[PDB]
Design a protein around this nucleic acid. Structure first.
Ligand SMILES: Nc1ncnc2c1ncn2[C@H]1C[C@H](O)[C@@H](COP(=O)(O)OP(=O)(O)OP(=O)(O)O)O1
Ligand SMILES: [Ca+2]
Length: 1110
DNA sequence: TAACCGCGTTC
DNA sequence: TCTTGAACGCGGTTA
């Protein structure tokens, strides 16, 4: 019935594709040799596939197909279409009566079925499926996806009927119908365009020849084509102290760039002084000359925009958050001028509210920043991404001064708008475009979806490609039960124990200062007898070389034990430290690949016993955690019996809500607790013989990442080799390092999402057991590593796969082998001595792999890809301490390089989005001062100097700060994940600020989720909770009669005329906050390091006073 | 004071 | 509709 709507949509897409140079190309005819080795002979048209979309065509109801958008070698563009029948399978219980089902479904689905056929597939959840047994299914094929749905609609009813007890009519009777044989439907929830891309092995970014036989990969061409790339950014008028609205506000300026060339278009109706050609080259690598069009009115701006789009024919349009600001604004402003943007440039919102087009992919760079840039949310704004990635500080302009600068400073506005463009285009070209289009060559998705989809969904696709190419039947998406019980107690949450985190030592540790070490002798003993096989291991495994080919093996073997000797008899020494960090590379991946860990490889003793019941078993343990009400099962009945009369004028999911609520109070009433958390150590069997398509997929992507990681390591040294005198060489080498580090980091979230996918909702390969084993194993490796560095040094902090430590300046350090050829083989004893212990204790000797598929012969061997990598030595490492006795602070510290630059700053308020600007600016000013001072006491003093400097300001009640600089240093800018309406009954500074932002300015302030709550804490009302004294810092720039009235009720002081900022601030609250930061970063850690409180203006807590005088 | 929540980091 | 995980810090309220 809705077909016509789908047929109509496709049609219009063709007209637009034609309007942008995409004519549907049908290739010539040919009857001869198909083999790809004859590509030049076969007739057709080669092209670089840039984009693909599902569609509906008629013979010349629609028949499903996929449009394929190409850029040919001769500088042209063309479209081509493959047709593929949508299809899903039917499973059966008794595989003897498959034909009865086949006949039944043929007559039942006569309305929608086109064809049908028995097929066989591998099923990894079947007994003796490894010995060669296949799964029989019925392949339902259809003309289009619409009819495939109608089937699922006509089959799901049966599926529910076979799951409900059959209502017999005769009680006394003592054959089975064909409907009762349908077990399930399978591979039914696969996107059609994805289905075609997998089944025909077509990928975006690959070179193909389009022939009558089909598509052929011209693997001779490896380099991408160069599509026309445009990035654009808009500028809007905006109510003072409010947000832009497409209903009233106008576009004033639109900057954009097209393949290196820069353009600006201005609305003279708002921009007064006409703008002319100028140049913004932020850095030499980022050229950007700009020509300007000064259109008269706003519709001439939109018209000039659409006209130019059609001119250059762009296959890629890049923005920064254009999906939810730029595009929807241009759409409404075109609508309010009676302009159909679909009719004009073929863009429209899809079912997610994002703006896509057929001929052109919309590359919202923000999507990449959120997912792949590996940047914190406090840096995912255009300015920070421009600084972190492009490397230049962009032009900034206060949004409240963009509307008036149309009159006042129109030049300053034009530079800021082209600033947004330059940063957007060169961000896309240098970073996004290579990563996205190259990822498209292995992921069966077009660029639009490769950029936006969740990383878990990406892993799914990759895995779907393997499972299909190995004829493995896809498991359906996982579903969680609505309730779940344990020991009679209802479960709230069950999970597993994640990574092992440890804060051990706090305070300052510096290269120029000195530290005490208590060396375990018996650990030096353990290291000296582990010495021989480790040194062979370092060259044989870590460097993959022969012992008898390296020269100075014995030369090193003694120099290390010499220091091991001088450190053995002198097991108590006070020297300088060496600050090092050790990290296992791709830990959870390498833990999975090493152990053949994958969801299907996990079995009970029930099933693998039914196979070859023996190295099928790598018995591995994981730690289960459940959170459950203390109510026993009998208590549950009472609540179930009681809760039956809630409302009158209920779905199961709705009915669960009330059961939970009443169960909290009943559980809290008698056991004096609401949640019980129990650790149940568990065990799982992972068969070493299962089809390893999952774990191999993880290994492919891991190796995919190692290339870029190894290439960054390679170009690091190239910089070291080039003398400081040659700039260009160094500069280019720096440019290479930045490129390769981004590439390896962008692959990281996908590689780790392979371990995350096993817990994702709707996952096809769900295993809590697998995830737990991965996590636990790793905690055991890092704790085993800690136990050793404890014995030979002082480890400072530890997190999952990482260890921060200081080592005696004389512990064995680094050593360079000399190969007989004339090569230098690197050796770092500290890292390599750890690696051995892992290989001797965490190596899979049951790793079986299929050698002979015909005779089903497996060959056990030994696998271990778990390697520590070492970074260092560092000059300083500042770790904080808790305010509570004994407690420490994890996931938070600062490190400094040999040359003093900030190595790593982790976890602190400075990096996070929001938080109090005081602390951020304080933290950004102090950490660099722990590098000052000539001893731990002189160090903590230079810190205290700038500590008192910041303290002075607070006690000075802001007298030293200009009002403008004052608020920009006292404001807290927390964000709201949702709209206000959804935090009902909760209390926070963000909720109050939002609630007060609304009355002060309007309900249209809190309409959208993601509100920036910029607030300041007031003194009045006195002795009232802090969530109630949150003042919007916007009121302090509002009208004086608006200001007063609100500030009076917010303070509950109806007779207050003093509106000056400094009288309202509760400096006491700010002093406490700044006080805790001083305690945690300076004074307390000093006390645990034996220094006296170096900032005596901030006291110690009671317990820590009582412990200096023990 | 311990339990608990939202945000946003570190893995 | 989509949709990687757990561990942790911190200000702040809740029992
Ligand atoms: N975003 C994430 N999602 C899921 N698991 C993650 C994520 N980040 C880290 N992990 C887990 C899996 C990692 O192997 C483990 C150690 O973190 P980390 O060392 O940063 O990554 P890694 O060891 O995979 O990569 P690298 O080679 O860069 O060290 O923590
Ligand atoms: Ca790691």
């Amino acid at each position: 019935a809705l077909s016509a709507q789908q047929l109509l949509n496709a049609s219009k897409i063709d007209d637009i594709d034609s309007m942008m140079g995409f004519e549907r190309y049908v290739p010539p005819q040919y009857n001869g040799r198909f083999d790809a080795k004859d590509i030049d002979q076969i007739p057709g048209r080669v092209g670089w596939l840039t984009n693909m979309h599902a569609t509906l065509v008629s013979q010349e109801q629609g028949i499903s197909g996929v449009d394929f958008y190409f850029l040919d070698e001769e500088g042209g563009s063309f479209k081509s279409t493959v047709v593929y029948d949508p299809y899903f399978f039917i499973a059966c219980n008794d595989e003897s009566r498959v034909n009865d089902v086949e006949e039944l479904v043929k007559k039942y689905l006569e309305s929608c079925l086109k064809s049908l056929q028995i097929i066989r597939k591998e099923d990894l959840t079947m007994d003796n499926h490894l010995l060669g047994l296949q799964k029989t299914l019925i392949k339902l094929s259809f003309v289009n996806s619409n009819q495939l749905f109608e089937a699922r609609k006509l089959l799901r009813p049966i599926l529910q009927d076979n799951a409900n007890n059959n209502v017999q009519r005769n009680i006394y009777n003592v054959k089975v119908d064909a409907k009762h044989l349908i077990e399930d439907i399978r591979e039914y929830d696969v996107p059609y365009h994805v289905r075609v891309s997998i089944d025909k092995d077509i990928r975006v970014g690959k070179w193909y020849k389009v022939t009558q036989q089909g598509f052929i990969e011209d693997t001779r061409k490896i380099a991408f084509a160069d599509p026309v790339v445009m990035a654009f950014a808009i500028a809007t008028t905006k109510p003072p102290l409010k947000f832009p609205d497409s209903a009233v506000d106008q576009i004033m300026m639109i900057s954009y760039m097209i393949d290196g060339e820069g353009f600006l278009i201005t609305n003279r109706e708002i921009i007064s002084e006409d703008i002319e050609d100028f140049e913004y080259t932020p850095k030499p690598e980022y050229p950007g000359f700009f020509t300007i069009f000064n259109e008269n009115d706003e519709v001439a701006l939109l018209q000039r925009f659409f006209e130019h789009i059609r001119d250059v024919r762009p296959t890629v349009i890049s923005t920064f958050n254009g999906d939810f600001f730029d595009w929807p604004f241009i759409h409404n402003r075109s609508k309010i001028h009676g302009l159909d943007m679909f009719d004009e440039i073929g863009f429209a919102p899809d079912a997610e509210g994002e703006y896509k087009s057929s001929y052109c992919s919309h590359m919202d760079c923000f999507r990449w920043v959120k997912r792949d840039s590996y940047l914190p949310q406090g840096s995912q704004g255009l300015k920070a991404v421009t600084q972190s990635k492009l490397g230049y500080n962009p032009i900034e302009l206060d949004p409240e001064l963009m509307t008036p600068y149309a009159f006042e400073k129109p030049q300053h506005l034009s530079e800021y708008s082209v600033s947004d463009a330059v940063a957007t285009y060169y961000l896309y070209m240098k970073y996004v475009h290579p990563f996205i289009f190259s990822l498209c060559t292995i992921i069966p998705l077009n660029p639009d979806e490769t950029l936006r989809k969740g990383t878990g969904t990406l892993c799914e696709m990759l895995l779907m490609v393997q499972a299909y190419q190995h004829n493995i039947l896809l498991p359906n998406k996982h579903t969680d039960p609505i309730e779940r019980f344990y020991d009679g107690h209802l479960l709230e949450s069950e999970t597993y124990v994640g990574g092992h985190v440890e804060s051990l030592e706090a305070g300052v540790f510096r290269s120029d200062l000195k530290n005490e070490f208590k060396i375990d002798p018996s650990a030096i003993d353990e290291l000296l007898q582990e010495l021989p096989e480790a040194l062979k291991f370092s060259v044989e495994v870590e460097n993959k070389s022969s012992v008898d080919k390296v020269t100075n093996f014995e030369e090193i073997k003694n120099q290390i034990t010499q220091k091991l000797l001088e450190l053995k008899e002198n097991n108590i020494r006070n020297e300088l430290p060496l600050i090092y960090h050790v990290d296992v590379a791709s830990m959870y991946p390498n833990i999975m690949t090493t152990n053949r860990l994958q969801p299907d490889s996990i079995k009970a003793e029930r099933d693998c016993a039914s196979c070859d019941f023996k190295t099928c078993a790598r018995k591995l343990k994981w730690a289960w955690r459940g959170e459950f009400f203390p109510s026993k099962m009998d208590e549950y009945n009472m609540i179930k019996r009681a809760l039956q009369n809630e409302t009158f004028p209920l779905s199961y999911a709705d009915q669960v809500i009330h059961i939970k609520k009443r169960l909290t109070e009943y559980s809290r009433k008698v056991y004096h607790r609401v949640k019980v958390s129990e650790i149940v150590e568990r065990e799982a069997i992972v068969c070493q013989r299962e089809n390893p398509f999952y774990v191999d997929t993880v290994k492919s992507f891991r190796d995919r990442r190692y290339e870029f990681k190894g290439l960054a390591k390679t170009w690091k040294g190239n910089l070291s080799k080039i003398d400081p005198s040659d700039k260009h060489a160094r500069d280019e080498a720096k440019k290479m390092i930045v490129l390769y580090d981004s590439l390896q980091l962008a692959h990281k979230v996908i590689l780790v999402s392979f371990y995350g996918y096993v817990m994702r909702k709707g996952s096809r390969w769900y295993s809590m057991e697998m995830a737990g084993i991965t996590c636990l194993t790793g905690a055991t490796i890092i704790q085993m590593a800690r136990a050793l560095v404890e014995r030979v040094g002082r480890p400072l902090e530890l997190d999952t796969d990482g260890i921060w430590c200081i080592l005696p300046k004389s512990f064995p350090e680094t050593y360079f082998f000399t190969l007989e050829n004339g090569k230098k083989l690197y050796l770092s004893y500290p890292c390599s001595m750890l690696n051995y212990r892992v290989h001797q204790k965490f190596t899979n000797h049951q790793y079986q792999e299929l050698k002979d598929p015909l005779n089903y012969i497996y060959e056990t061997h030994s696998e271990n890809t778990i390697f520590f990598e070492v970074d260092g030595p560092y000059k300083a490492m500042i770790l904080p301490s808790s305010k509570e006795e004994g407690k420490g602070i994890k996931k938070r510290y600062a490190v400094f390089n040999e040359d003093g630059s900030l190595a790593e700053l982790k976890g602190f308020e400075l990096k996070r989005r929001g938080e109090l600007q005081l602390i951020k600016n304080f933290q950004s000013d102090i950490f660099k001062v722990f590098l000052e001072g000539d001893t731990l006491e002189g160090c903590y003093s230079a810190v205290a100097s700038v500590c008192n400097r910041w303290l002075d300001v607070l006690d000075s009640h802001g007298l030293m700060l200009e009002d403008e600089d004052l608020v920009s240093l006292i404001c807290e800018n927390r964000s709201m994940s949702k709209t206000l309406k959804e935090y009902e009954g909760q209390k926070s500074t963000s909720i109050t600020t939002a609630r007060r932002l609304g009355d002060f300015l309007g309900e249209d302030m809190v309409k959208d989720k993601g509100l920036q709550c910029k607030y300041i804490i007031s003194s009045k009302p006195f002795n009232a909770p802090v969530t109630e004294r949150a003042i919007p810092v916007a009121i302090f720039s509002a009208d004086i009669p608006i200001k007063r009235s609100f500030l009076r009720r917010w303070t509950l002081d109806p007779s207050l005329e003093d509106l000056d900022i400094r009288t309202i601030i509760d400096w006491g609250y700010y002093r406490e906050r700044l006080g805790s930061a001083i305690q945690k970063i300076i004074t307390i850690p000093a006390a645990l390091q034996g220094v006296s409180n170096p900032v005596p203006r901030v006291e110690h807590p009671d317990w820590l006073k009582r412990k200096i005088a023990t």
